[model samples]
Target: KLNKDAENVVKKAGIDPNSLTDDQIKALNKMNFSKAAKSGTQMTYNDFQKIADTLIKQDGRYTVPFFKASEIKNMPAATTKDAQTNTIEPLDVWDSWPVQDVRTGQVANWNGYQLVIAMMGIPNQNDNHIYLLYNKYGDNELSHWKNVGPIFGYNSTAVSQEWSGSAVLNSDNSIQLFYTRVDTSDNNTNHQKIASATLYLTDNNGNVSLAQVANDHIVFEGDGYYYQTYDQWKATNKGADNIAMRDAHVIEDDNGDRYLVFEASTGLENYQGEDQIYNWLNYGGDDAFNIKSLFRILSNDDIKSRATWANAAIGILKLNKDEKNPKVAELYSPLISAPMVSDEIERPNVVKLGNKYYLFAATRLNRGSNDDAWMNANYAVGDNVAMVGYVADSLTGSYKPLNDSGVVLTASVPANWRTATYSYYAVPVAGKDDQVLVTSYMTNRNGVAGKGMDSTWAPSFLLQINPDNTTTVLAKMTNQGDWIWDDSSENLDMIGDLDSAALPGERDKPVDWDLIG
Candidate 1:
């Protein structure tokens, strides 16, 4: 709905019959009142009609109120923060390992201990089933894992639900699991929708349930009618297939508003090309989640659209307190043109610490896929830097890299892990000096990828960052079977079992790798 004040502006503009042609009106309606303007502004139908009404009243005579899409002008631009100031290097604070494939639900923190979770199965076994994998010292700290087999399943092809998303742990210590569920009943076309549920962590100890944050969470499609989601999407229906949306991020804004940022399915090949935003706070309520207001951060044909997916579309949504709320906004100027990030980028996590917002994303270079779609987990030095864009006033504002093209975290393959898959889930842990905890899934090539029910990977763990951005290797965990306490790398292989006795001691302290050989 146009604001009340904007409405008055429209009524004042009398109808202009000559300026608009009959053909123009027909075209504008089909656009759903949305179209891109040259000035990197997107003019909505409401914006169009209001201005049209104003134009018509310019003359003292009465005229029919017809809108010309061309007449619509985009609103102002959004803000963007840069990252080139006093850049600091993260302390060598993490370790890595090898994995058969990159799995999304690989690792998460349990209680205070870092629990590395992953799925393994015979190539021919039910691909739809995900085998659970866990490590006490995070994925990089230990080797050999206890196979917690087949945690869950899906009815459709493995492709539909193979790569599940993260589990949101609430303040109450309960877990809410969300995943991509396929609606197979609709035979005419394949559909994708996110379904969530509560994970009973204990007999009554843990408490958390997954509920609909947004009623119609079905944001994108792929059945020819709409786009389908995929691994590392890079394009829209158009040829530039590089732009896409994936890995949806949810964060609480300062105003208590829940902001969601996701990949636009943009890739390097077909850059669908820009970012999009929708406020969950306004649409989601206690019982229902509605996302009717989908606004572009900007209106550039290249910059405004979320043309990229994964960490690319995955930018941090920081809450900027302003005197008043910004009804609608854009991020910096839209990049209507194609964005070719120099290095290969991967999963990104955004968080706000102190006064500034930080975007932590992994980068790779010279890494290609064995199959067109299979992005190799090859450790490529990420040319991509800590690409920072800031918005002082709001989420949608003029956004720019701190410097013209600055680099935050340099492009280097981690030393601890073999395959690039090592850094699948880099968690930013708030600790003594504002540090982060990096996690990954290490796979044992000798082990039959979960053949033994309790099979596990030999841990290769470490701390990748310190309070400051310094890098350091973590000592291995104690080899107390399940409750081990040795901090050396030697005991990494037989670290523990699913049984509490085999688990390592609590991970409340900084990572210890003394147990590793």
Candidate 2:
């Protein structure tokens, strides 16, 4: 036993340190045992055991690891060289996805190739201003993509469609588009709501159209119960910050139940008071890495603000799908809750592998309030953005963070609004049930307002979900419709594993403050 060296954390859990499983024993040995005690958390054998279970699964494959600012390269978000290589629209396209078969996780084949849609905008506009537009990748070839036109026509007087969402191909040939709807006559302010409409697709000899629409309705506008309503977001934000309740993604569970998962704020009713806040913080389980240290070290006044500043959630709502008219019956409690950890975890989507559900969303490095030291003491920071995830046995129960800290993939590029690449959507490989291809917009934020961010493709990548339910990034990038099982239809550039620090020539370039806004 290492106890002979006057330290034995493994010995604290069981009667005999000699009787531990090799995986358990090896896991405890390499981790920061000395660091744990110095951190003063007083974690017992039980606490140590939970952390082990989260990082190293039952079969021994570790959870997908983290990314650092160190070893990453800021690959151009989209092919910026010329128009021929750039696989995006002529105008700027942001937050886009294909018409998908929600059942099969495949891009619903339309015309010749699968259809794609995005929020097309005029350049040099603020990030908040979006004029919802639709477009398509050239064909199923996954080669160069092009722009179609508006779902409905776009104008400033029309209700602004804010951000990314899910579009499904129904069995009856009708298409259901679920998107974030922003209302109000005042163009200066915002009011976000989750809404949907039904449209019929027409393929007129290679040209496509969803010109017919009906049953346009508001699904659920964040009731201020489980998730924040726009009024609630304003009440808390008028005094503090954060407004989510958008990006609606519809999913189907094993039970064939229709569930809509979306990005949202932790509601005031749930985390308003001290007792409620503490209970909300401990919802999933004990904090192994203590991601909530910033919140725990707060005054009552500070505690009250937790619902405002540091609240993010993956909320669930059961939907009744109608070919012409679908609706949400109830807005249930969130499947995943982050009270004192992160304020915004955007674009929530799920990929089911075997009996397990892998929930994915995008977040960024959120250090402490007064200083970055407290947050950095335990975990890693990416190039200002990260695509994180959680795991759960059921859709309604709590979700535990993956790899113990919720980071699956992050960039190691320059940290700034100008170079930021965010908004990732997890799409299962066309035929492979366990493999995934993650898609995101390479954001040219400041450039988009005046010109279309010169919008291009941010080079897609692959992820393999290991048998242990943890995920790992494959050393490869992908095309829109590329399948993991197929041969290299296109000679795509490859990438090695990435994490939290700079590699070599990347040392001490320029340091900017963290956080999105």
Position 312, candidate 2: lDDT: 66
**lDDT, candidate 1, 1-517, per-residue tens:** 3334323322444433345344333222222222232221121222212222322222111111111111111111100010111122111111121111111112345543333223333323333223333344333232234333333432324444423333444445444433345443443222344333434343223322222232223433222112224533322233334333333343444555433333232223222322212211111112111111121212334322222321123322222322122111222222111122211233444445443343433433222111111112111221111212222223333332321221222212222212212333334432322432333333212221223212222222322333232233333322211212222323433322222211122212222122110
Which predicted model would earn the best lDDT?
2
Tell me the lDDT of model 2 at 304: 43
TM-score: model 2 vs. ground truth: 0.71
Question: For residues 340-384, what per-residue lDDT tens digits would candidate 2 score against the true structure?
Answer: 445667888877766677888875444212123223312232244
Worst ten in a row by lDDT for model 1: 74-83
Report each candidate's C-alpha RMSD, comma-separated, in the order given. 21.6, 10.3
lDDT of each: 0.28, 0.52
Stretches off by above 4 angstroms in model 2 are 1-90, 126-143, 157-159, 184-187, 272-296, 299-308, 367-382, 416-420, 448-453, 479-485, 494-517
TM value for model 1: 0.42
Could you estimate the TM-score for every candidate?
Answer: 0.42, 0.71
RMSD of 1: 21.6
